[PDB]
Amino acid sequence: MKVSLAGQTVDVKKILNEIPKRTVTAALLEGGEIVAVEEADDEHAERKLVRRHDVEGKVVFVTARPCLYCARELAEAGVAGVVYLGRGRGLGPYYLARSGVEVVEVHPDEPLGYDPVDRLDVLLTFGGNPYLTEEDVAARVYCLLTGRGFDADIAPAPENLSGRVEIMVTRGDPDEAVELLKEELPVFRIRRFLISGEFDRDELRERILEDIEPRILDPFAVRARIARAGAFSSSREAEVFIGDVLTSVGREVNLNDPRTVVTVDVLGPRVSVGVEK
Amino acid sequence: MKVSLAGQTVDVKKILNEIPKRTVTAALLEGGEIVAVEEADDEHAERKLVRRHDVEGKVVFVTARPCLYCARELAEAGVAGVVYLGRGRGLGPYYLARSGVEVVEVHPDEPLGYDPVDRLDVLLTFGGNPYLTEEDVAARVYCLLTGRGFDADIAPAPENLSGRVEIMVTRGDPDEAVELLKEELPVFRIRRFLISGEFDRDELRERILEDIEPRILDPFAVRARIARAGAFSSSREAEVFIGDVLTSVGREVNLNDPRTVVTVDVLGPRVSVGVEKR
Ligand code: NA
Ligand code: NA
Ligand code: NA
Ligand code: NA
Ligand SMILES: [Zn+2]
Ligand SMILES: [Zn+2]
């Protein structure tokens, strides 16, 4: 759906699926295209946007309802329009409508299209609860991690994949985090990954030998999940490959009762692997 | 300011200006220009629209936030998009959005502005985060519940308080409702309160002794949260008061390793009390 306001037309799905959504985010639009983006940290997204860029005459897209202080700054800075998602306690829209600024609250009937994290430190998996959403689970997760002093990029339903929430820990220890999460999200599958990136086959071999093999207790078994085919095309293709690297080094495999399981996740070009005992 | 949804483009000021505003009004759009219009009487505007006209695949413009009953009927009749003015308590938009209907609020006037419920049977909370909004959680909770024959009265973000959704069960058994909420939404904090009202401290003491004390397993602790001060000024003031009522009659505090936690919520005049094991 598209909104026409203040001299430009903004297409909602495009902008959504094009800005980061790790936290509340503000994007500055000109001619309908994004010329700036800021993400909330201690500072609100809108405030960073206004002081770090020139917003006058333009349209701002925000991923939540702007708080009052921000609406004031946006209006005073001379923004002409604001398009926002209908989330949050913020009252700034009502102040904006009374300040000459065109404002619209959109509710897409489709998933937002979150991005998969660049480094899948922790993967969370859950099923069969029709009323629960990835965003609910990501909400809890976000609350716990930040609550405990952690910094993380959290991605619910990346690529609109259901049952999934992905975590990348940028500050603090990933294994402290899974411990936390295991404790609170009892019925969810939590998985730690020791390496995760877009690797050549050669690069992936070197990485497995470096960070995965030494952690192995024989016998092992490789279990691969293909969330999106790319670097590998089937579970067995990746199992055989990773298995061979190790088995030729030379570790022992036993698929029936291994002491260590080597986990692999594949999302398109992204390969992640960890070990569980 | 025009809006393009469900294939149409609607010129907001033009439409707005063609519709009567005596009461909440709904207008059926094509092109999109108005082709039908119905006004609220004893019946909601949207209900008359669906009931009196063919809305399938069309777009509807409503002069307030549609309620959940209206959203259900709009959706389950094939509406494809809904534009509405930003006033009223209606939650239907959130229902619509999760039913494949595109929806937009224009001319945001005033917030939902929900009141705290009269009797807090069930409180569903969650913390600060950028993924969730209270009215969506409540719309979903409302479908869950009504889906199983419960009836309730729901208040997302009363007084615009964050991460908070209040439930007064009005048909079916509250505890069964909390059982259901805990299975089907296991990731939220969900508390049942056995008593909830506006009391003088004497009435509160009585209520505590009748409904709370008999279900305690020693030892206990009291953990209260003040959403807004009133009947009690602070957590400790509430905990001290309720602690003494319970000790004064033989119960025993531990506060280190309680076998029972006595929960309290304070919101202005309204105190609610519950009991949790372990
Ligand atoms: Na995207
Ligand atoms: Na630890
Ligand atoms: Na621990
Ligand atoms: Na709660
Ligand atoms: Zn703000
Ligand atoms: Zn209605």
Curated annotation (Swiss-Prot), chain A:
It comes from the Archaea. InterPro entries: CMP_dCMP_dom, Cytidine_deaminase-like, THUMP_dom. The keyword Metal-binding applies. Residues 175-277 form the THUMP domain. The active site is at E46. One of its GO terms (biological process) is cytidine to uridine editing. PROSITE patterns: CYT_DCMP_DEAMINASES_2, THUMP. Zn(2+) binds at H44, C67, C70. Binds 1 zinc ion. Its cofactor is Zn(2+). SMART domains: THUMP. One of its GO terms (molecular function) is tRNA binding. Residues 1-102 form the CMP/dCMP-type deaminase domain. Keywords: Hydrolase, Metal-binding, RNA-binding, tRNA processing, tRNA-binding, Zinc. Its EC number is 3.5.4.35. Homodimer. Belongs to the cytidine and deoxycytidylate deaminase family. Catalyzes the deamimation of cytosine to uracil at position 8 of tRNA in 30 different tRNAs. This editing guarantees the proper folding and functionality of the tRNAs. This is tRNA(cytosine(8)) deaminase. It comes from Methanopyrus kandleri (strain AV19 / DSM 6324 / JCM 9639 / NBRC 100938). The lineage of its organism: Archaea, Methanobacteriati, Methanobacteriota, Methanomada group, Methanopyri.
